[PDB]
Structure 1
Amino acid sequence: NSFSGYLKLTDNVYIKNADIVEEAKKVKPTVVVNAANVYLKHGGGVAGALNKATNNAMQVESDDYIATNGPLKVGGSCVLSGHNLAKHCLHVVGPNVNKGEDIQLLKSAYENFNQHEVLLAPLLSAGIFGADPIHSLRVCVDTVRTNVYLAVFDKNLYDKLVSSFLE
């Protein structure tokens, strides 16, 4: 859990302008969070980048999890292997508001982080899931009580997040 160059926002939330894949390789955290969908199909975005970095091992394991257990619910999670990126991957499903899913489930999604002492995570429901990223950071700060290191791979969004939080 050798995190470097993060800005501490609150006693338990830290943020960095960085690609979560590059962070996982440098840090080898105990837990990396994937911004998953309910069938664990890692077709693009953050999930696609994490799966590519495992040379598709994450997708094969995920398909075998879904066959045996069925899909996740929106707001839910499962713990699978971290492969070469971490000890464990916490696959968390935030709501996709661009597909009509309820934004209130973002609180449920961040509540899954509280079962793990330290996590490397992306900003849930941001990007093409359509949530307002400043709202997602506020939900994270108000909900997560364990130690979370957010990697946001966009300097423009990183700067807007830090400015809106420190105002």
Structure 2
Amino acid sequence: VNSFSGYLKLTDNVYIKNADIVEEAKKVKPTVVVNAANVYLKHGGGVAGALNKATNNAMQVESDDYIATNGPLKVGGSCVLSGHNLAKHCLHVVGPNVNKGEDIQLLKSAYENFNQHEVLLAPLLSAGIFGADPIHSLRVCVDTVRTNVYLAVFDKNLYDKLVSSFL
């Protein structure tokens, strides 16, 4: 038993809810919140910008030190940093950005990072300003992630379409 509430169960291990991931992290305080990161950990907009704003820019400060030490992530890769006031940990995961021409097949590799964590609060990778089809992203998620994932979908219209179109 865990504290995630009001989710619709899609499969054995994937759950979805129309919710603002920032508000959901502040309320649940999950072990892991997933950020929709880029390789530079520049949290400017979309989910990343929102999560970072909610940390009063502490996420960005920590991220800049990480990059200065380690260099950029790989598309499809991830790193674990602090969750600040939102979670114990933040898993920064880099899905491909279609608006940069990145290979959509890397979306499966991106979701594989979730399997290193028993339970996660997450957005749909590569959705939103990353330019991929969220229906495709949800399918890859369900077909790749084996651990327990609670997906927060900000847009109600998209959530309903994601739900009604789900096989």
State the match for 1:15 in structure 2: 16
| Superposed CA offset, 1:130-160 (max 9, x none) | 1111000000000000000000001100000
The number of aligned residues is 166
Distance 2:40 2:99 in 1: 17
Residue 134 of structure 1 aligns to a residue whose secondary structure is: helix
TM-score, normalising length from structure 1? 0.98
Distance 2:82 2:129 in 1: 25
Distance 1:22 1:2 in 2: 14
Per-residue deviation at 1:128? Answer: 1.4
Per-residue deviation at 1:59? Answer: 0.2
Per-residue deviation at 1:164? Answer: 0.8
Residue 142 of structure 1 aligns to a residue whose secondary structure is: helix
| Superposed CA offset, 1:17-64 (max 9, x none) | 000000000100000000000000001110010001111100000000
State the match for 1:131 in structure 2: 132
| Superposed CA offset, 1:112-132 (max 9, x none) | 000000000001101111111
Structure 1 residues not aligned, in runs of 5+? none
Residue 103 of structure 2 aligns to a residue whose secondary structure is: coil
| Superposed CA offset, 1:60-96 (max 9, x none) | 0000000000000000000000001000000000000
The residue correspondences of 1:1-167 to structure 2 (distance < 5 A) are 1-166=2-167
TM-score, normalising length from structure 2? 0.98
Distance 1:115 1:157 in 2: 28
| Superposed CA offset, 1:4-24 (max 9, x none) | 100000000000000000000
Distance 2:46 2:10 in 1: 25
Per-residue deviation at 1:99? Answer: 1.0
Flag as ranges the 4+ runs of structure 1 deviating above 2 A. none
Residue 165 of structure 2 aligns to a residue whose secondary structure is: helix
Residue 15 of structure 2 aligns to a residue whose secondary structure is: strand
Identity of aligned residues (%): 100
Distance 2:62 2:95 in 1: 21
Distance 1:87 1:42 in 2: 19
Distance 1:24 1:133 in 2: 21
TM-align CA RMSD: 0.7
Residue 6 of structure 2 aligns to a residue whose secondary structure is: coil
Per-residue deviation at 1:108? Answer: 0.3
Per-residue deviation at 1:98? Answer: 1.4
